[PDB]
Design an enzyme around this catalytic site. Structure first.
Site, PDB file in Angstrom:
ATOM      1  N   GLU A  70       0.779  -1.244   0.000  1.00  0.00           N
ATOM      2  CA  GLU A  70       0.000   0.000   0.000  1.00  0.00           C
ATOM      3  C   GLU A  70       0.808   1.290   0.000  1.00  0.00           C
ATOM      4  O   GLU A  70       0.289   2.326  -0.435  1.00  0.00           O
ATOM      5  CB  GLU A  70      -1.006   0.023   1.156  1.00  0.00           C
ATOM      6  CG  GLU A  70      -0.391   0.084   2.553  1.00  0.00           C
ATOM      7  CD  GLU A  70      -1.431   0.402   3.631  1.00  0.00           C
ATOM      8  OE1 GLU A  70      -1.812   1.595   3.761  1.00  0.00           O
ATOM      9  OE2 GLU A  70      -1.864  -0.532   4.343  1.00  0.00           O
ATOM     10  N   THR A  99      -7.140   5.168   9.040  1.00  0.00           N
ATOM     11  CA  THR A  99      -7.484   4.679  10.369  1.00  0.00           C
ATOM     12  C   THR A  99      -6.338   5.029  11.329  1.00  0.00           C
ATOM     13  O   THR A  99      -6.581   5.502  12.447  1.00  0.00           O
ATOM     14  CB  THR A  99      -7.716   3.176  10.318  1.00  0.00           C
ATOM     15  OG1 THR A  99      -8.800   2.904   9.390  1.00  0.00           O
ATOM     16  CG2 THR A  99      -8.046   2.644  11.711  1.00  0.00           C
TER      17      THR A  99
HETATM   18  N1  LIG Z   1     -18.257   6.842   5.862  1.00  0.00           N
HETATM   19  C1  LIG Z   1     -17.291   6.709   6.783  1.00  0.00           C
HETATM   20  N2  LIG Z   1     -17.388   5.805   7.768  1.00  0.00           N
HETATM   21  C2  LIG Z   1     -16.415   5.694   8.662  1.00  0.00           C
HETATM   22  N3  LIG Z   1     -15.321   6.452   8.593  1.00  0.00           N
HETATM   23  C3  LIG Z   1     -15.118   7.405   7.666  1.00  0.00           C
HETATM   24  C4  LIG Z   1     -16.125   7.578   6.675  1.00  0.00           C
HETATM   25  N4  LIG Z   1     -15.716   8.534   5.863  1.00  0.00           N
HETATM   26  C5  LIG Z   1     -14.533   8.982   6.281  1.00  0.00           C
HETATM   27  N5  LIG Z   1     -14.178   8.295   7.376  1.00  0.00           N
HETATM   28  C6  LIG Z   1     -12.909   8.530   8.087  1.00  0.00           C
HETATM   29  O1  LIG Z   1     -11.893   7.894   7.321  1.00  0.00           O
HETATM   30  C7  LIG Z   1     -11.056   7.173   8.195  1.00  0.00           C
HETATM   31  C8  LIG Z   1     -10.325   6.085   7.424  1.00  0.00           C
HETATM   32  O2  LIG Z   1      -9.699   6.648   6.290  1.00  0.00           O
HETATM   33  P1  LIG Z   1      -9.042   5.669   5.213  1.00  0.00           P
HETATM   34  O3  LIG Z   1     -10.046   5.215   4.199  1.00  0.00           O
HETATM   35  O4  LIG Z   1      -7.886   6.439   4.655  1.00  0.00           O
HETATM   36  O5  LIG Z   1      -8.372   4.536   6.141  1.00  0.00           O
HETATM   37  P2  LIG Z   1      -8.115   3.010   5.829  1.00  0.00           P
HETATM   38  O6  LIG Z   1      -7.276   2.863   4.597  1.00  0.00           O
HETATM   39  O7  LIG Z   1      -9.417   2.312   6.032  1.00  0.00           O
HETATM   40  O8  LIG Z   1      -7.141   2.684   7.052  1.00  0.00           O
HETATM   41  P3  LIG Z   1      -5.581   2.202   6.922  1.00  0.00           P
HETATM   42  O9  LIG Z   1      -5.160   2.439   5.487  1.00  0.00           O
HETATM   43  O10 LIG Z   1      -4.826   3.115   7.949  1.00  0.00           O
HETATM   44  O11 LIG Z   1      -5.707   0.698   7.133  1.00  0.00           O
HETATM   45  C9  LIG Z   1     -12.042   6.677   9.232  1.00  0.00           C
HETATM   46  O12 LIG Z   1     -11.451   6.197  10.430  1.00  0.00           O
HETATM   47  C10 LIG Z   1     -12.872   7.912   9.467  1.00  0.00           C
HETATM   48  O13 LIG Z   1     -12.278   8.821  10.380  1.00  0.00           O
HETATM   49  C1  LIG Z   2      -2.209   0.735   7.812  1.00  0.00           C
HETATM   50  C2  LIG Z   2      -0.983   1.286   8.590  1.00  0.00           C
HETATM   51  C3  LIG Z   2      -0.618   0.376   9.763  1.00  0.00           C
HETATM   52  C4  LIG Z   2       0.185   1.331   7.582  1.00  0.00           C
HETATM   53  C5  LIG Z   2      -1.343   2.703   9.162  1.00  0.00           C
HETATM   54  O1  LIG Z   2      -2.603   2.748   9.902  1.00  0.00           O
HETATM   55  C6  LIG Z   2      -0.198   3.277  10.045  1.00  0.00           C
HETATM   56  O2  LIG Z   2       0.863   3.645   9.564  1.00  0.00           O
HETATM   57  N1  LIG Z   2      -0.513   3.345  11.328  1.00  0.00           N
HETATM   58  C7  LIG Z   2       0.384   3.885  12.351  1.00  0.00           C
HETATM   59  C8  LIG Z   2       1.415   2.809  12.680  1.00  0.00           C
HETATM   60  C9  LIG Z   2       2.564   3.459  13.433  1.00  0.00           C
HETATM   61  O3  LIG Z   2       3.523   3.853  12.786  1.00  0.00           O
HETATM   62  N2  LIG Z   2       2.440   3.576  14.789  1.00  0.00           N
HETATM   63  C10 LIG Z   2       3.488   4.218  15.562  1.00  0.00           C
HETATM   64  C11 LIG Z   2       3.704   3.675  16.859  1.00  0.00           C
HETATM   65  C12 LIG Z   2       4.251   4.485  17.836  1.00  0.00           C
HETATM   66  C13 LIG Z   2       4.507   3.985  19.091  1.00  0.00           C
HETATM   67  C14 LIG Z   2       4.267   2.723  19.367  1.00  0.00           C
HETATM   68  C15 LIG Z   2       3.763   1.901  18.443  1.00  0.00           C
HETATM   69  C16 LIG Z   2       3.488   2.342  17.207  1.00  0.00           C
HETATM   70  O4  LIG Z   2       3.625   0.646  18.943  1.00  0.00           O
HETATM   71  C17 LIG Z   2       3.879   0.786  20.328  1.00  0.00           C
HETATM   72  O5  LIG Z   2       4.463   2.084  20.524  1.00  0.00           O
END
Ligand SMILES: Nc1ncnc2c1ncn2[C@@H]1O[C@H](COP(=O)(O)OP(=O)(O)OP(=O)(O)O)[C@@H](O)[C@H]1O
Ligand SMILES: CC(C)(C)[C@@H](O)C(=O)NCCC(=O)NCc1ccc2c(c1)OCO2
Ligand SMILES: Nc1ncnc2c1ncn2[C@@H]1O[C@H](COP(=O)(O)OP(=O)(O)O)[C@@H](O)[C@H]1O
Ligand SMILES: CC(C)(C)[C@@H](O)C(=O)NCCC(=O)NCc1ccc2c(c1)OCO2
Lengths: 266, 265
Positions: A70, A99
């Site tokens: 990703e 997220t």
């Molecule tokens: N319809 C929705 N329902 C829930 N959350 C939403 C919605 N629209 C926007 N959001 C926001 O978008 C955030 C997630 O964004 P995104 O799609 O970039 O993350 P993700 O790719 O699912 O998570 P990651 O890539 O970190 O695994 C949610 O946590 C929320 O704050």
């Molecule tokens: C989908 C992903 C996991 C790529 C995305 O949601 C992301 O990058 N999340 C944040 C992950 C990260 O870098 N966390 C930082 C972190 C900071 C401090 C920490 C710890 C993790 O584990 C315990 O102490």
């Protein structure tokens, strides 16, 4: 037709390409079963997958699919979208506020992950629930725009009083650091929610300017769905990026950078 | 005697020297009783620092030199590190107070390299909002054996059964598991453990980021935010070691600014 899926922790982002027409669909990760089924009913020339739930999709569909990392896919898609919308940036930090939040330095030809933090949309939702009992995302975000942080947050001038501060007085000294000076108060669900978003935006932006400086770029590109329907977050991030001498950029369909990218890594 | 006072957003740190130092702390809240105490005392030299140095100075009935907190904190820390048997050619320091301030010390002087409002003040305020506890001893105590697992989301939880591209045990989203556990029970311990978690994690992340930028492995954490809070020290200690850096805590590191005010004079 060609399909790109970035299946995240919270949202599944889908891009369909026919001819040159793009379709941008979002769907809940909770409803991943109905994405798999939709997909199984479709005529697909090429399917590319990315994101944390890519494998759940891949193991329940009737067709092969290329899977990408990703971080690569998001960089590729965002390059495509930045070009199309007129941004021609030699280098940049990008902050994928999903997220959780991941931070990347793009040097002109490729990306490198340079930081990450667990303050992002998941926190807005989760910590938002604990303070407001609101599960519905639109409801949650709309209500937070109505909020005032001043009784919740402590500024530098609150600490330095009538003396000259070592950094400008209007800056946030301490998120939620005023709560205990206002125990006469209610603390309304709106106010609390603005402070949550407040802290999330400031942390994200702080880390982003930090690595911007480390990697000697002044351009910061924000993406992720966490900005959708959240003017407050977008404001918080934008103002402080500018205040610290960096240039923020948001991009149309920023949240699909991943889904786009996956298509053009095939 | 000589007196050095670092009057913060939340606490006033007092250092008395005759010969031999004494350490004493009082709430910023009760700044009046600190002023009363200064006024009845014969003092050879009074040195002040911190945001509330002004409030002190304009209510005392004697003169006072006022030093800037970042310089003073740096100076006192250098002194305390040496007394406690450390020889660090350079380091990051992370002054974790009401809010957090981060510095790079190159061997001769400090530069501020950033800051963040995640700190002791957030623990108190957000922890009050999640629990209604105002007493600090009690708040930090409730937190200590909390369980963050139904509250925080790990990378492994997003990545399901596939190989994540960063370690799966890492926190992915603070408070990010809340919506998957809507079937009651967010208890005050778990919630407060999660507040401490997010504050430790944000602070450390900032710290190790500036440690990489400035090419040092050493990170020294000070501030009263670590008092009565083993879990904050643990959270910060563990993530720092995880990222390749060496964490240091310092006995009376909260009094760095007070000590430094005395020796810049
Ligand atoms: N319809 C929705 N329902 C829930 N959350 C939403 C919605 N629209 C926007 N959001 C926001 O978008 C955030 C997630 O964004 P995104 O799609 O970039 O993350 P993700 O790719 O699912 O998570 P990651 O890539 O970190 O695994 C949610 O946590 C929320 O704050
Ligand atoms: C989908 C992903 C996991 C790529 C995305 O949601 C992301 O990058 N999340 C944040 C992950 C990260 O870098 N966390 C930082 C972190 C900071 C401090 C920490 C710890 C993790 O584990 C315990 O102490
Ligand atoms: N006895 C206490 N009363 C209130 N807060 C305390 C106490 N001991 C430690 N703390 C914590 O330490 C923080 C203050 O850290 P400190 O280094 O004294 O910062 P400041 O200089 O802004 O007062 C508080 O926000 C709180 O988290
Ligand atoms: C006593 C100090 C104010 C020196 C100490 O508490 C501290 O350094 N606090 C943090 C100040 C800081 O650097 N804040 C970061 C910040 C980050 C984002 C912001 C913002 C401020 O204002 C609005 O958007």
């Amino acid at each position: 037709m060609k399909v790109g899926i970035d299946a995240g922790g919270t949202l599944i982002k889908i891009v369909q390409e026919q001819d040159n027409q793009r379709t941008f669909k979002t769907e809940l990760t909770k409803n991943i079963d109905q994405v798999v089924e939709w997909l199984n009913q479709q005529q697909i020339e090429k399917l590319c997958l990315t994101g944390g739930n890519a494998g759940v999709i891949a193991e329940n569909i009737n067709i092969p699919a290329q899977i990408f990392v990703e971080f690569d896919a998001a960089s590729q898609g965002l390059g495509i979208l930045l070009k199309e919308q007129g941004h021609d940036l030699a280098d940049y930090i990008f902050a994928n506020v999903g997220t959780g939040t991941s931070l990347h330095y793009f040097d002109g030809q490729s990306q490198r992950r340079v930081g990450g933090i667990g303050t992002g949309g998941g926190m807005i939702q989760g910590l938002g629930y604990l303070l407001s009992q609101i599960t519905d995302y639109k409801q949650l975000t709309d209500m937070a725009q109505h909020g005032d942080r001043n009784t919740i947050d402590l500024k530098v001038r609150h600490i330095y009083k009538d003396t000259e501060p070592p950094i400008p007085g209007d800056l946030t000294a301490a998120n939620f650091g005023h709560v205990l000076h206002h125990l006469d108060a209610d603390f309304t669900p709106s106010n609390k929610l603005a402070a949550v978003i407040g802290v999330v935006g400031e942390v994200v932006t702080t880390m982003a300017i930090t690595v911007a400086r480390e990697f000697k770029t002044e351009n910061i590109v924000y993406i992720g769905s966490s900005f959708h329907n959240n003017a407050l977050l977008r404001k918080v991030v934008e103002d402080y990026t500018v205040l610290r001498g960096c240039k923020p950029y948001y991009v149309e369909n920023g949240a699909f950078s991943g889904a786009i990218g996956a298509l053009y890594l095939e």
